[PDB]
Design goal:
Number of strands of chain D: 4
Chains: A alpha/beta (96), B alpha+beta (64), C mainly beta (75), D mainly beta (50)
Number of helices of chain C: 0
Bound molecules: magnesium ion
Oligomer: part of a larger assembly
Distance between the termini of chain D: 15 Å
Subunit structure (chain D): Part of the 50S ribosomal subunit. Cross-links to the P and E site tRNAs.
Largest sheet of chain D: 4 strands, antiparallel
Shape of chain D: elongated
Structural class of chain C: mainly beta
CATH topology of chain C: OB fold (Dihydrolipoamide Acetyltransferase, E2P)
Helix content of chain C: under 10%
Protein name (chain D): Large ribosomal subunit protein bL33
Order of helices and strands of chain D: EEEE
Strand content of chain D: over 45%
Keywords (chain D): Methylation, Ribonucleoprotein, Ribosomal protein, RNA-binding, tRNA-binding
Strand content of chain C: 35-45%
Number of domains of chain C: 1
CATH class of chain C: Mainly Beta
Family (chain D): Belongs to the bacterial ribosomal protein bL33 family.
Order of helices and strands of chain C: EEEEEEEE
Organism (chain D): Escherichia coli (strain K12)
CATH superfamily of chain C: RNA polymerase II/Efflux pump adaptor protein, barrel-sandwich hybrid domain
RNA sequence: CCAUAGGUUAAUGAGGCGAACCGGGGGAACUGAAACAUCUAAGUACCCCGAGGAAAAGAAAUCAACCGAGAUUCCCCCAG
RNA sequence: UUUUGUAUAAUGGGUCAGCGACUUAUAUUCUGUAGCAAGGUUAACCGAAUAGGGGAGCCGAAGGGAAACCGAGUCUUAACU
RNA sequence: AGGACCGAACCGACUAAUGUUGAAAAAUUAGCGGAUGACUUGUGGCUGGGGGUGAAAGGCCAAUCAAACCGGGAGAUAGCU
RNA sequence: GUAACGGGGCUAAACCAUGCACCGAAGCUGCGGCAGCGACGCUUAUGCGUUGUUGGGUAGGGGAGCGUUCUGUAAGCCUG
RNA sequence: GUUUAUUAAAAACACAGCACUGUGCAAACACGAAAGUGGACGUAUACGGUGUGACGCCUGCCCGGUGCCGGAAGGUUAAUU
RNA sequence: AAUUCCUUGUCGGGUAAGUUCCGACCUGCACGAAUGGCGUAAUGAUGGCCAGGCUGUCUCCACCCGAGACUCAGUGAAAUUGAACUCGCUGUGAAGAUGCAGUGUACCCGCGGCAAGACGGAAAGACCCCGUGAACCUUUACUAUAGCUUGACACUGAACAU
RNA sequence: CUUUAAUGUUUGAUGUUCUAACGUUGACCCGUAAUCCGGGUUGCGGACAGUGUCUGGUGGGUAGUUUGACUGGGGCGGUCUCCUCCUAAAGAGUAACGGAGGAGCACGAAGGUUGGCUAAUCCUGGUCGGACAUCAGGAGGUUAGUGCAAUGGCAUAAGCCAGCUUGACUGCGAGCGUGACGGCGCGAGCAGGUGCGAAAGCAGGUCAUAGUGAUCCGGUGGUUCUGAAUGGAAGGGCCAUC
């Protein structure tokens, strides 16, 4: 960072933002995964048991990340607008 | 020895999808009354670290 | 008692007669209207002349005071 | 300098304000001007000139 | 005055040494901050006191999160 | 050796032989390369000891936004051509 | 009688020559000043380092003093050669 | 110390002009040789016979290598 | 008399003398976290500091600044409440 | 003037000749009354100037006695030193040449002398700048702080008037 | 309940008195053949001194440091940022302690728009008309004027005047120009909403280029974005801004 006696960019420029305390317990799940849950039920903790998200996550989504295969019942997870069509376009079930 | 971050660097830059860094404009803090509204409008939105300046901030953020 | 000067403002012509420009591209930075905006060319608050249309720059002298006018014909 | 910064407050509850300057000696009264309140989306009257 | 000091004698022990960890009592500046006084170097070097096969900590007025994990010294993550 | 420049009357070596100056540690990043590959590797720790076990965890497939969140979008703005 | 007088031993150091890889890390040779006094000396003892002691020159503190000597932080820092 | 043609000497061996020769360089050319890259002639883990070119060099950057000392293949292989 | 031992012996430091000023003694000061020693087994005709330097003739003018002595009514004024 | 810049001031005094000295004047660049003023007999290895003495200090050096130099024997060092087949002059060039150029001069090696040169030896210039260097000193620099001082609660309480 | 006295208590102040902590480097006794020391008695003092905690003052006594750079050595003197011209060799840039000047402000209209308007100075004539206040005539043609330095602009005026007013609007942004950088600047057009006009239209500040201050720490005000168990809260965030 030394740029000569001149004020470096990281002092030149201002701070912004705060950390909210949520990134570390919220994970995202892709379609290339979910079939590996070795039990055919997608819950809040099944995915934890399978070592796919992480032990301290409390919220999860699904997003549209391609390839959707075996029918799954996504329970206690949010599903994006797109993802619901892919999950159902291969059966599966969504419930709150 | 794990590396130590220049911690002030980490409070002004966040890394984007391809590998550059986004940042906030200077001058937005005080002494705003004399500045034209247009000038402040184009300074509100975030910017990219320029090519000439990338060669050091990256030195400062090995864990970004 | 001296010892002062001003920074150069990098004025002068940026696009000359016979050059393809987009819209918005600056053609001349000036102090007064040494050059004037002609057909299809616009004038900013510091008399910076800019293109209002895609095309080629054209310097002509028109009217009774022999002023220089810059226009842009689409190509 | 010798010209003070003031704040104009929107006469519609919004918390939008403009900032400008004033010769407080030569111009002692409260400045009053229509400006666009981006919250009520209309040209409302603005007050204050400290 | 009683009394306590004070005195006398036996037996018993303690006295000092030598690396290092430990525990605690004391505690710098150079340096770095391309000046330097906050901060850094460091609770580091040094002082002393003491000590075991180790010491010191140790058994929830500790955490958790409305589900529960349960003394406590240590190895890698968490995580620069 | 140093300089703009040195027979330079600028510096260093009297001669010899031996000694005598870009290393060690961990990170992180580029390259050459190996294995493996939408997955790649485990750390301690166990030990029949470099074998084998151990995926806690870390890198990646998805990032936009301070964050809420939304998600092949998203942030802007009341909405954007 | 006197920090009187001339003046050896004693003490000290104004002049000059030598000596400068000296005989000697200040001395010798020719003169010098003081020599019963605030004298001179033996033997011991006491002051310890931003401290001492000084009839004051920053003088003396073991041939070292604008901060003595040994070992330690220590390969301090060296943007300099 | 000649000491204001580098010297001796020069009335041209000075100067102007027109010519025509001749010396003169690590340049050009000639002959032999090496490397880099470039292509063909052709096939091939090519190499060339070729063949266009190119090869002064601080700092500095790239690339290919020689040898020392120690371990293994090495109870192998040398060696009175 | 004294001095920079080891280039400065002097017009320098000291001296008796003179002045100012602190000091009632468990003094003031000075050494030392403190005990306790000096001062002094002295007691203001005595002790400390500071300036001046025998003897002679003498030491004027300024209190605004500056530094000290005294002042205590009013201004500002900390902890605490 | 131990102060005086101008200044060798001016004037007298001494001398043949006196930027010093002595005397004076006052124009005090820029004396002064205990950071003492003026003057003082005595004392002083103190500073300045002069005079009778004395002279090798000198004019201007002559001659002599000894110690080393010098010759033999015995013993035996030193700093320095890229390498030496280590010359004059002129010019040249990192601008002052034993090494270049031109040119002149010179048989090859000692021992005794001098010291003009080797930008001689010795010392990583003591002047001088520069380093965001260092170390002791200063004060109405900064900032803290010992000592001194102000108080407040505590050690630390009991009565009475107001 | 409105108001006050008494007393008891409580504690606040001012003085006087006491004695028991608290001092005694007053005398005597004892441990005892002891100038220490302790205990004991007694006199003297006494809620004071002295000491610890904190607090205002003092403090080169002693400590740590700072004490700019440039510069035709340094110091002295001057400079340090911006703007205009110039050297600058006819695009941009260009140097020195080269040559001349300026800025650290002003404006609620000295801003937008609609309509509409034209200077400087010679000659002649004219009340008080004086060389030059003012009316008139022609000559004259931006030398005037531009809120101020220079330069380039200016008549369609950017100059001068007015009625109406607020576009000095908030959101944005094709494309560029200039920057090592941070940044700096030009802008047709778009949504919203606006002013003026009959309208086409013109307005996102002042003819333009000076009118300056990054980062931090903190301050307002709106914003449900965050809220360390939860609900709020605090602090953090963003916008506005000092
Ligand atoms: Mg995981
Ligand atoms: Mg803000
Ligand atoms: Mg430092
Ligand atoms: Mg320091
Ligand atoms: Mg234990
Ligand atoms: Mg429970
Ligand atoms: Mg040089
Ligand atoms: Mg070079
Ligand atoms: Mg030589
Ligand atoms: Mg040199
Ligand atoms: Mg040399
Ligand atoms: Mg040498
Ligand atoms: Mg005598
Ligand atoms: Mg005598
Ligand atoms: Mg002497
Ligand atoms: Mg001496
Ligand atoms: Mg003798
Ligand atoms: Mg003698
Ligand atoms: Mg002795
Ligand atoms: Mg020292
Ligand atoms: Mg250290
Ligand atoms: Mg070293
Ligand atoms: Mg001639
Ligand atoms: Mg040839
Ligand atoms: Mg060939
Ligand atoms: Mg080469
Ligand atoms: Mg000595
Ligand atoms: Mg002498
Ligand atoms: Mg006295
Ligand atoms: Mg005196
Ligand atoms: Mg007072
Ligand atoms: Mg005379
Ligand atoms: Mg004479
Ligand atoms: Mg007086
Ligand atoms: Mg005086
Ligand atoms: Mg006197
Ligand atoms: Mg004497
Ligand atoms: Mg011999
Ligand atoms: Mg040469
Ligand atoms: Mg020569
Ligand atoms: Mg000699
Ligand atoms: Mg030399
Ligand atoms: Mg020399
Ligand atoms: Mg040197
Ligand atoms: Mg100091
Ligand atoms: Mg300088
Ligand atoms: Mg130009
Ligand atoms: Mg007239
Ligand atoms: Mg809470
Ligand atoms: Mg807030």
């Amino acid at each position: 960072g030394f740029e000569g006696g001149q004020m470096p960019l990281y002092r030149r420029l201002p701070k912004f933002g705060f950390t909210s305390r949520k990134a570390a317990i919220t994970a995202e799940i892709r379609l290339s995964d979910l079939a590996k849950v070795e039990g055919g039920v997608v819950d809040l903790n099944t995915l934890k048991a399978a070592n796919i998200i992480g032990i301290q996550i409390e919220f999860a989504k699904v997003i549209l990340a391609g390839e959707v295969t075996t029918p799954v019942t996504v329970r206690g997870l949010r599903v994006t607008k797109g993802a619901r069509a892919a999950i159902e376009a291969a059966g599966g079930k969504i419930e709150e | 020895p794990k590396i130590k971050t220049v911690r002030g660097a980490a409070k002004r830059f966040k890394k984007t999808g391809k590998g550059g860094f986004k940042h906030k404009h200077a001058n937005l803090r005080h002494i705003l009354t004399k500045k034209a509204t247009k000038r402040k409008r184009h300074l509100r939105p975030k910017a990219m670290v320029s090519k000439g300046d990338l060669g050091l901030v990256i030195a400062c953020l090995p864990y970004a | 008692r001296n010892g002062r000067d001003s920074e150069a403002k990098r004025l002068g012509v940026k696009r000359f007669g016979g050059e393809s420009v987009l819209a918005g591209s600056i053609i001349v930075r000036q102090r007064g209207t040494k050059f004037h905006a002609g057909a299809n060319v616009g004038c900013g608050r510091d008399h910076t002349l800019f293109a209002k249309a895609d095309g080629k720059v054209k310097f002509e002298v028109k009217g009774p005071k022999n002023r220089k006018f810059i226009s842009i014909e689409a190509e | 300098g010798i010209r003070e910064k003031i704040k104009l407050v929107s006469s519609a509850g919004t918390g939008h304000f403009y900032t400008t300057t004033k010769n407080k000696r030569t111009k002692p009264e409260k400045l009053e001007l229509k400006k666009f309140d981006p919250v009520v989306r209309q040209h409302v009257i603005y007050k204050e000139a400290k």
